[PDB]
Structure formats: C-alpha cells, structure tokens
From Swiss-Prot, chains A, B:
PANTHER family: K(+)_H(+) ANTIPORTER SUBUNIT KHTT, PTHR30445:SF9. Pfam families: Asp-Al_Ex. It comes from Tetragenococcus halophilus. This is Aspartate/alanine antiporter. GO terms for molecular function: antiporter activity; identical protein binding. One of its GO terms (cellular component) is plasma membrane. The keyword Aminoacyl-tRNA synthetase does not apply. The gene is aspT.
Length: 543, 543
C-alpha cells in the first residue's frame, strides 16, 4: 500500500478534496431520524484516509479556509446582531460565564481525584474543550516552569498526543449531545423553536403580494376612451397607478383607441379594475417601464414621496408590496423604498429621494478582499497577561471584521455586497476543509494513543467535554428560564466548537441561522479567551 | 520602512488580499474609452507592493486558486463545447499550429540576428510566450547539455531573471494588443461580434412569455357556472388549461358560485379568456399548484405528453413558454419539459414521463470536490519525449476534467450542479490571486533586471511576444477568412495567456463567454504542450 500512501502524501490537494467528496456522501447517510452530517462524515472519512500513511499538518489552506468560514458567518449575521443583542445579550453573557466556571470546577475535581499529570491535564482540556491554542500556551508555560529538563520534555511530548486522542470525541460527542439529545431533552424541535423565536423578532416576514405593471390594451368602446391619463389615474383607487399611455408618462394625453394603458400596483386591485372596465391584457414589448430600489437620503422630502403617485410612480416597500400613504410620514432616512413605473418618472423621483440601491447579485471583490486582509491584520494583534500570551485569533478577528463590515454596508447600502449564496458556500466548505485537514493530520497518533493511555484519558476527556454542558443546561433551562435556541447558541460559543455551528445552522435553516449565529458570537469570544487562558493556570496548579 | 516590509512578508494573506483589494479599485479606473481591468490593475498594484520588501513565491494558495479558475472555465464551457467544435474546430486547430510555428521562426531569426545566448533565449521565450514550465524544462536541458560547469551555472542563473524581466510586458502588452487594438484593427466591436456569433448558433434565446397559473374567482351570473371543469377545459383553446376548481384537480366537479378556477398558460391567451368571460382575478393563497421540471426518460411516451392537457397539466419547454402539440412527437429523450398545474396531476404525469430536474441554486459539494481531486490527479500524469519532460499540467488537466464533468452532468441532469454565480466568482478571483502571487514574487528581480540587460532583452521579449500574433492575425483574417472572435480565442489559447481569458470574457459578457472559452480551449492544450517543448530545442540549437 506504499504506492497509495506515497501518492496521497505527495499530492495534498487530491487527499483533502477526496476526503471532502466521500465525506459528504457519508454525511448524507440517514439512519432512522438521525443524519451524520457533513462535518461528522468528513471527520470520519478523513481519519480512515489518514490511517493509510503519514500526513503533515497543513496550515496554509486549512487556516485560510477557516478564516473564510468565520468571515462568512460574521458577514451573514451582521445586520441582525444589534437587534438580537438588545433582546438577549446579557443572558448569553451570563451563560458563557457559567459554562466556563463549571468546566473549570469539573476539570479540577477530576484531575485531583485521578492524580492527573500536568501535560495530560492540559491535553485533555485542549481536546475536550476544542481549543487548539491551549497546547501552545501550555508548552510556553511548561517551558517557563522550574521543573527538571526530562520532566519538561516528557510533558511537552505528552501534550500533543493526549490532545489528538481526546479531540476525536470532543467534536463528535459534544456535537451530537447539543444537536440531537439536547432538543429532545428540552421537549422542543430545533427547527420549530428556532423559527418561532425568529418570528418573535422581525426576521421572517410573510410573502407579500408584489406590485407590478400590467400592459393592458384599450379596446374600442371602452369608457376610458376620451379621458386623460391624469383623470384616469385620479379616478383609480390606492394601489393602482396609471404609468402612462404607450411609452410616454405625460399626464395630459387622451386615451385613444389602440393605446396601451400600463397599470401598476397589486394583483387583486388590478383585477378589480380589469373587471370594472373590461380591459384586455397584452404582453407589451417595452423596456421603458421598470422598478428601481431607492435608498432614501438623510433629508428625504415627504411631499415628493406623497406626490410620486400623482407624477405616475408607485411607491412600495423593499419587499414589493404597496404601502399606505399614511406610512409616508413614518418613513425615515436609510430606508429603501421601491419606485415602479415609467423610466422618465422613476428617474426623477429617485433623483429627489436618494440613490439607487445595489443589487445582491453583483459581487464586491474589493469589499471581500479588504475584509479578509483586515481579518488577518486584526488576528495578528495580541497581548500577554501574567506571562501567558493571548490573542484575538483568526476566529474572533474574522468574526469582528465581518460584523463591522456588514453593519457598515447595511448602514450605507449604495455599495455592492457579497452574495448570500457565496457566503453560504464559503461557510460550508471552509469549516469542512479545516476539519478534513486536522483529521488527516491526526489519525496515526490517534490510533497509537488508543494503545497507550487508551481508555482512561479518553473517558476523562469525554467527561470533561460532556458534564459542563449538562450542568450549564440544567442551570439555564430550569433556573435561568432561557429559550432553547439561546441556550444552544451560548453553549456552542462558550465551548468554542465551530464544527457545531455549520450543523446546527443547517438543521435550523436559513430562516433563523442568523439568530443562531448571533447567539453564538458573543459567547465565542469570551469562550476563546478564557479557554486559551485555561491551560497555563491548570499546569501551574497541578505541577 | 523595515516595519512595513517585515509585517507584509510575515503575513502572506494580508499582502495577497490587500493587493487584490487596491488592484480592483485601480482596475475600475477608466481613461477615455479604455479600462485597465482587474488583471492588469492587480499586476500593477502587486509590483509596487512587492517593491517594499522581499516576498517568497507561494505555490500553495496561488496554484490551488489557478486550478479553481481553470475548473470554473471548463465547467462553464462544458455543454456548448461539442456544438462549438463541430462548427469551428479545425479552423482553430489550424490557427494554433500557425501561431506556434510563426513564433518559432521569429524567435529563431531574432536570436540568430542578435547572437542571443541560450539561457537568455529560453528566458525570453518563457516570458514573452507566458509559459512558466519552460524555465524548468530549460534547466533540465542545460543540466544535461555537455557544457562547462561555470557556463551551465551562468545560464541557470540567467534564465529566471530574464523570465521575470520579460514576463511583465508579456502579460500587459499582449493582452492590450489582443483586447483593444485587435478589435479596432478588425473593424468590429468585441461585444457586438461575440453576440452576433453566439446568435448564429443556438446560445442566446429571446426572452419567452412564461406560462403561469392565475387564480381567478368565479362571480355569480357567469356563463361558466353550471358547467363541468372538464367541459370548460375542453372549451378553452391551446395554451389555456383549467388546473382545477378550489384545490382539487378532478375533472367532474361543476363550477358553482364562489369557487376559484385556476387557469394556467400564457399571459395574452389568459387575458383574452378573461375579457371573454369577465373573470375577476384574486391572489389565491394556495400551495397546491406548482411548476416542476421533468427530464424525459429514455422511452418517454407521446400519449401521456399529449393527454397531460386533458389530465389538467400544462406542458411547456424548459424556458417556460407553452409548446405546440405537434412538437410533442418531435421531443426526444434527455430533454427537460416543464409541467405546470395541480400537485396531484403534476406528480403523476411526471411519474410517467421521467424524473425531476435538480435546481441550479443547490450546490453539489461532492461533485465539485471530486472534480478538483481528479484535476490534481490528472495533472500529475506526464511523460518524457526525447529526454524532455512534459505533462498535462494544472491548466490542461483541470480544463479536461471540467469539460467531461459538465458534459456528464448535462447528459444526466437529475443530479445537482455548481451554481453559475459561484463558477463566475471562482473564475474571477482564482486567476487574480495567482497574478497577485506571481507579481509579488517577482518585483525586486524585475527592477534589478531593469538595470542589467534592461533595454535589449525587454525589447526583444516584446518583439517575440507581439510579432507572432500580428502575422497569425494577418494570415487568419486576410487569407483564412475566419471570424474575429474565433481568431482572438485561438490566439489566446495558442499563446497560453490565461490572464487574457478573464478580461476578454468580461468584455464579451456572459452571453458569448462560453463561445470564447470554447474557442480558447483546444488552442490552449496544443499551445501549452508546444510551448513547454519550445525551450529545450532552442537551448540545444543555440548552444
């Protein structure tokens, strides 16, 4: 099997993209009502592939794709972050500070009970709590510690192996617990509860009747013949604007036989007018009638918005449904109205109302590249506390950069934005590629550590990974009376388990995935910082 | 400036994603009617950034993104490749074999005239003809050559520097020549000529009247009252199918007052029926009426397709427009029909006609990953000819894999496909990232080679890069009577200038970009192979 092993280690792209192809197929497997999922299928396939030969750890593609994934989450959760935090931000920050202290207490108790060594303790924490930087901080701390050189070398060798052994369960077992067992224990369905919580806020509006233009043709003998376009437009009720005879929006032309009288507004109102006047619909071939999206200026005038109907343009909300005139005063600046009608009339009320909103299909390459560059530059930033180095790291820096960038773009919508399909693809493939890389990097060491310290360390790692979640769940749900989706998001952020984000978001759906990411984000930063600090203090205490 | 240089070299992601952000902004600059373009803006910004400090060449992100770009082109050009090759494939293969021999003749003549050394000759060819593997093949050949060790070392040192000096002009000047000067010299507009050539084939159909369902409400006193749904459906002309009273598609129910009579078909025909019966349109709230896309089976029955109208389902082409019944016999198998109507009736005729077609919005992660893995595995393949190693390489292997994968997916459409927006984003960012990486890698050597061999080598490289294009253009347009877009595509493929693909495709537009890529692809492979072989023979001849 030396040929297969040599080929797989020689070509890294082939291995990481053949573990990402079979991994998804394995994830699509459904047993009963339980689906393995893409992340668990990739972490299972990558280990088996990595058993074939030795694979060095690749920090060149995996880290960049993880940065892309974190930026995708931060950009997708941008607009709703403030609204989510105003409702549930202090509860989440009080649940992130309970999981961490509970994990500290449980780890200390187990380590004291089972006389666990310092290196094994730091490896177990780094694996079960799914924080990789713990190994580096522990290496630095054990280097500083005044111990014998042989003991320091032994601990520094023990740390990576225990981390690799425990990390396998700390990604599958914890994810299964907080994704399948947890909703059942809380007597709720993840999808249903997330949708209901998102409906409690203004996230998912009902589909609205879009207001459009129909090119009706006037037949001879109609009562509309012999009357001006302005007269007919005034005679029409709200939600029915005459956009102009033929291709002209002038208000003084008379309706002679053989002319097209384009009518804009809602479907039911247009149908009532059609039944009233016995008009015949014709699929008119004209490019002079359009719907534009206008971002209102800082001092948008109410008079022009009110009189756009008189000018011949239908004003509507961004969704597409026509809005009541009383809403005109209510809405705002920075709100995006939609102007529907003739080109000449829509290009003037827009000129007096604000500026055109950029469509979602266009991709802002400069915006995306600047976001990635600033994410890297901010992840560089760090500081040392009590001789222990900490930093924002790729995850936190990318999350913050995505948040601020999306908020700025939402505030000023005249600039283009990265499409949601692209953001979803990056969110999916970025985390899965990182999981594949780390699983391929650590499979032989995992099977080797099955033989030595195989059972005790694995079981203690499972206990330290599972028990804090249980106690924090009991405290939050039975005493702190949270909502289930907030509990799950706060725990996922506190544990710093990025693998759970993709799976829980895909089970929730795109409707409340922004709510889940918003719940995760504040917990994620505090969990990252405290878990990074968790290793060195444990090493100092135990040894 | 040592702090800035150290930070930029230390963080590679920051540098390559800050040269990709300012690069696009510089590319958006428009002077007169000439736009620099994204690729030239990135190659200009990256050189200035690379003058700050020394940057090692990164083959980890740039090569993978180039593979992604080539796969994106190969997948986008998949379905139309055979149709394009049947019309213009031999002309393109006869223009790829003229550019290469012309370049050989011109390079040999210039090298003999100016007593150009072997290493400088190989570097000039590798730079002007934009083929990087030439430097490696030349290094191997000069290693084999029985020359003095000092002379071999001198040539091996000279090759990279001359390549770096000449590569700057061989990407900007040639692109400008074949993108701006060439259309003007051919008295055609690139966009207009490409659109006309695509219209000559069946690529861009005119927008078609989509056939939909309108939920009309029957009012009291209507002539439709007292008649069965089947009777009304038979009384309706072609293109008007009664999809069922209320939410039931049964053919025997009578039309009582207060019922919704959903009518499916074309807008103008529905409007004529509305004028005939004075029906009132209502935005009915029902999810039981849908349009599905059905891929016909190998033995699709004509009888069921003909009688779908009687059953209560409108059959239409994949575009959306209703089709004539005589077209039913014409168709097929593998053609995708569209069935519009009630859920119960559409889920049965589909069951007897074939299988549902997968929507474009869904992304096939397994398909994409398998494509990338097979691209890498095929790029591994190679062989040696006359002691000179050649291989398919990333470009050719990825192009072939994308072609075959897209053709297979088009043949069997029941499986999902990678979205076109994602393919476009990869095609854009993949090449630009590679350009940024190579420009950052070679800027100090470029400015240094400005001082030594600054003018003569640069001018000879420009001549060898430009003149073969001119003579092959004259031969093709004035004697071989080609079309302009085919000439441009064949030259771009023969020169193996992947940087021109993105810019010419973006100027052409998405309408005929598949035609341009199809014209490029066969030229690209032969150009790659012959340019790879071009170096060693020149070294052997000159020295």
């Amino acid at each position: 099997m030396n040929a297969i092993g040599n080929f797989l280690v020689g070509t890294p792209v082939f291995t990481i993209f053949i573990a990402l192809a079979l991994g998804y197929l394995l994830g699509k497997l459904k047993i009963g009502s339980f689906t393995l999922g893409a992340t668990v299928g990739v972490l299972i396939v990558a280990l088996l592939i990595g058993q074939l030969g030795v694979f060095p750890r690749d920090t060149c593609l995996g880290d960049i794709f993880f940065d892309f994934f974190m930026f995708a989450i931060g950009y997708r959760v941008g607009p709703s972050f403030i609204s989510s935090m105003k409702k549930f931000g202090a509860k989440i920050v009080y649940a992130t500070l309970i999981f961490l202290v509970s994990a500290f207490i449980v780890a200390y108790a187990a380590f004291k009970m089972f006389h666990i060594g310092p290196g094994i303790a730091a490896g177990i924490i780094a694996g079960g709590l799914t924080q990789s930087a713990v190994i580096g901080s522990s290496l630095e701390t054990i280097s500083k510690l005044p111990i014998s050189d042989h003991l320091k070398t032994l601990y520094s060798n023990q740390i990576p192996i225990v981390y690799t052994l425990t990390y396998v369960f700390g990604t599958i077992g914890v994810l299964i617990f907080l994704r399948d067992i947890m909703p059942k224990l809380m007597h709720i369905d993840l999808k249903k509860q997330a949708v209901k919580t998102a409906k409690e806020l203004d996230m998912i509006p009902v589909p609205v009747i879009v207001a459009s233009t129909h090119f009706y043709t006037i037949n001879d003998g109609s009562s509309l013949i012999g009357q001006t376009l302005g007269t007919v437009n005034t005679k029409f009720a709200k939600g029915l604007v005459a956009a102009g005879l033929n291709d002209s929006a002038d208000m003084a032309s008379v309706i002679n036989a053989g002319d097209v009288l384009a009518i804009s507004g809602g479907i039911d109102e247009i149908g009532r007018a059609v039944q009233e006047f016995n008009l015949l619909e014709v699929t008119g071939k004209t490019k002079a009638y359009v719907s534009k999206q206008v971002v209102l200026k800082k001092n948008f005038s109410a008079d022009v918005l009110k009189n756009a109907q008189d000018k011949g343009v239908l004003v509507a909300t961004l969704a597409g449904d026509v809005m009541d005139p009383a809403q005109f005063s209510t809405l705002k600046p920075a709100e995006s109205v939609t102007l529907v009608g003739q080109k000449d009339a829509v290009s003037e009320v827009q000129s007096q109302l604000g500026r055109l909103r950029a469509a979602e299909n266009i991709i802002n390459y400069s915006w995306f590249a600047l976001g990635i560059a600033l994410s890297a530059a901010l992840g560089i930033v760090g500081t040392k506390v009590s001789g222990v180095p900490i930093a924002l790291g790729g995850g936190t820096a990318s999350l913050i950069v995505g948040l601020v960038q999306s908020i700025y773009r939402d505030k000023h919508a005249h600039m283009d934005t990265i499409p949601d399909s692209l953001l979803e693809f990056f969110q999916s493939i970025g985390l899965n590629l990182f999981i594949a890389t780390v699983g391929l990097s650590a499979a032989k060491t995992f099977i080797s550590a099955i033989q030595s310290m195989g059972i005790s360390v694995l079981l203690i790692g499972a206990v330290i990974s599972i028990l804090p979640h249980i106690i924090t769940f009991v405290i939050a749900y039975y005493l702190m009376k949270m909502e289930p989706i907030s509990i799950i998001g706060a725990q996922t952020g506190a544990d710093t388990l990025s693998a759970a984000l993709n799976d829980v978001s895909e089970r929730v759906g795109s409707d409340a995935s922004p709510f889940f990411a918003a719940a995760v984000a504040p917990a994620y930063a505090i969990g990252n910082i405290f878990l990074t600090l968790m290793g060195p203090i444990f090493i100092v205490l135990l040894s």
